[PDB]
Every structure is written in C-alpha cells, then in structure tokens.
Amino acid sequence: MRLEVFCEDRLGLTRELLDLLVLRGIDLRGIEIDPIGRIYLNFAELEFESFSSLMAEIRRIAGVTDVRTVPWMPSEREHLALSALLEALPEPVLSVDMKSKVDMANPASCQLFGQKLDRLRNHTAAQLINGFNFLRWLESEPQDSHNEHVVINGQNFLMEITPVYLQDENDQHVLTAVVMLRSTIRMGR
Amino acid sequence: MRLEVFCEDRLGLTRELLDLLVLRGIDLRGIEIDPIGRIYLNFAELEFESFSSLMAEIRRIAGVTDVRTVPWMPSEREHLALSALLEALPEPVLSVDMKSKVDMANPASCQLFGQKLDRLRNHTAAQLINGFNFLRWLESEPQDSHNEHVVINGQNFLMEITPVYLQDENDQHVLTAVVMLRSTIRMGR
C-alpha cells in the first residue's frame, strides 16, 4: 500500500508520521520525500477499517494538508512498468541465476507448470524443463542465444535462452509449436 | 548519495536515524527498509567533510552494527535487473502508452528501426511499423492478444501486441517469419 501525504514545511512532521505507524502496528518499508511538500509511505496492506481511521488520523497531524493512496512510490514507478510488460507477455517468460534457480517468472510460466510464483521460484531450471543442460550452458560463459525444442506436460514448445548482464544468469521464452502454426495462419488472404 | 546501515533489531533506530538527518539538515529523498534488518538512505549530494561527519555519527547510533556507501538502492537494483532481462531479449520488444507512443524498447528494436531509444520514444507505433492501426486497436478496449503479419524494412515479422494491466497500453513482440521456420526446421533434429 502506498500513501501520499501533502504537508506544509514543518519541523518534526516526518518523525510524528513514523511514530504514528509504529503506534498502530504498521511496519514501514519505505518513506520518500518530495521537497515541494509530499511524503510517500510504503507499508503492507491494511484491512479496510484500520486503513480509514489512519487516513483520518494522519490528517490531524499539525502541518498535514491532505493524504491519498497512490499506486507506487516514486522509487517503484519504472521497475513496476517494466514488470507489468514482462508479466503481460502471453507466453512463458522466466529468468534464472548462475545456479539456474528460477528468479523472475511471468503468469504464463506459472499457469503452464500449474503453480504460483513462490513455489516455481524454488526450482532450478532443469527441474522444470526436461531435455536441456542449463548449468553446463551457463558454465559455458555463453555469447549467443540458444534455441532448443522441448516437450513440457506432453506439449511441444520452442525454448529460447539468452545470457543476462556480464553473466548474472539468463532469461528464456517458451512458444507453443501449435500456437505458432495457428498464428502464422492468422494471415490467410 | 546512498548509504546502507546494518543494524540489530532495536526499537526506535530508524526514527533516530531520520532525526539525525533532519537535524544535520540533510536533504533526504528516500529510505528503504530491507525486511532482514538493513536500512538504505538516498539523499542529495553532501560535501565530503559533511558526508564523513554524517557516517561517523551514524556508526555511533546504538544498535547500528555498520554503515557503508552503496551504488544503488534495492528498488534501483530491481530496476536494473528488469531492464537487463528486457534488453537481453533476442528479438524486438517495445511497449507503447494509450496514445501508442513508444515507452520502452530493447536493443533488438533500436537496431531494427535504426534509431537510438531516446528517439524511438518520440514515435507512435504507426510511425515505425506499417500495416497495423495501433491506436484504433488501443481504443477498442482489447482483452486479448492480437497477431498481425507486418513488413519492417522489407523483413517479414509476426507481431503479437498484448494489452498491459488496467489498460495502460501494450506490449509488442516481433518475431522474424523466417527465423521461426529455421527454428521449427531445426526442431526436426
């Protein structure tokens, strides 16, 4: 949850806000400040009730002119736009580290394997996809991308695998051979 | 200027740290807390003599076990790791906003359209790719992905454009018709 607090230029206002979060059982994840007169607050979802009296309570603080909920902290905005677009990808995307452990994985990567992100992230890559040697490839210090054909839950896909940053690991896409043929026909004069 | 402060889990530390910076007149922009027990500070540039005094006084706050400058906030490390996935993707990827203006684009895209990313961002999608009404499709309130065969600089592509989030634009993926056949031909062995 992200709050934006509008306030005048007053001594001690930021402290009195953090005290208030502490009094109320709320553990702070982030606070950002705009010199113009805005304070953003990051903490875990409140239930609706604790939420509304808190807003009211923040508005009573000396120097606060207004509060609202906002979709992101200034710090989150761009990396959330990046995540959104990668999560939107209609087919499986997912990244792995140097130990080939799954890191980033999109919704389709989850639905195909039939599991939520946090279990899926517990896997190395060869545990999820039969037929390829991830760790020996990532050991290979790779230049180019790799294309392999794989079957996953009895389904034909093409898997492409590309190194990431020096070698901080790799990311890879999967495309259904069946979806490709249906979709290259999405032209029929 | 960014610091990382390691600290024991003691009541009042974060706020005492905030009081310190308020009092030294430090132009604090951001704090991020690491669920472990690490606090990151982002503030405007200090002269060297003050940065030093600051870091010295911080290391003497009770319960602080260390302080060090760091190149990035966690949010910024996250942004970097997501930019790196996007930029590694072998084939063109871009996103566009609700006016179909280009927001992000990977190097594969910069290379295709022959423009550095800065300039790519000046263009609507229909200024870069013929044979698709991007803006019209955006105003359709699309739910589903769309595939279109497009020709870009005389090279044939299958184009999949997908809607992003609570409609904020779209993700575009272009795959060469020819690399696909080559890959599905290789898949035969």
From Swiss-Prot, chains A, B:
Induction conditions: Interacts with its own promoter-operator region. Autogenously regulated by a mechanism that gives similar rates of expression of tyrR irrespective of concentration of the aromatic amino acids.
Residue ranges of domain PAS in the record: 78-114
Domain ACT stretches: 2-72
Taxonomy, superkingdom: Bacteria
Subcellular location: Cytoplasm
Assembly and binders: Homodimer. In presence of tyrosine (or high concentrations of phenylalanine or tryptophan) and ATP, it self-associates to form an hexamer. At low tyrosine concentrations, homodimers can bind to certain recognition sequences referred to as 'strong TyrR boxes'. Homohexamers are the active repressing species, interacting with two or three tyrR boxes in the targeted regulatory DNA, including 'strong TyrR boxes' and lower-affinity sites called 'weak TyrR boxes'.
Function statement: Dual transcriptional regulator of the TyrR regulon, which includes a number of genes coding for proteins involved in the biosynthesis or transport of the three aromatic amino acids, phenylalanine, tyrosine and tryptophan. These three aromatic amino acids act as effectors which bind to the TyrR protein to form an active regulatory protein. Modulates the expression of at least eight unlinked transcription units, including aroF, aroG, aroLM, aroP, mtr, tyrA, tyrB and tyrP.
Note: Regulation of individual transcription units within the regulon reflects their physiological function and is determined by the position and nature of the recognition sites (TyrR boxes) associated with each of the promoters.
Domain commentary: Contains an N-terminal domain (1-190), a central domain (206-433) and a C-terminal region (444-513). The N-terminal domain is required for transcription activation functions, dimerization and ATP-independent aromatic amino acid binding. The central domain is involved in ATP binding and hydrolysis, and is responsible for ATP-dependent tyrosine binding and hexamerization associated with tyrosine-mediated repression functions. The C-terminal region contains a classical helix-turn-helix motif responsible for binding to DNA targets known as TyrR boxes.
Name of the protein in its database record: HTH-type transcriptional regulatory protein TyrR
Organism listed in the record: Escherichia coli (strain K12)
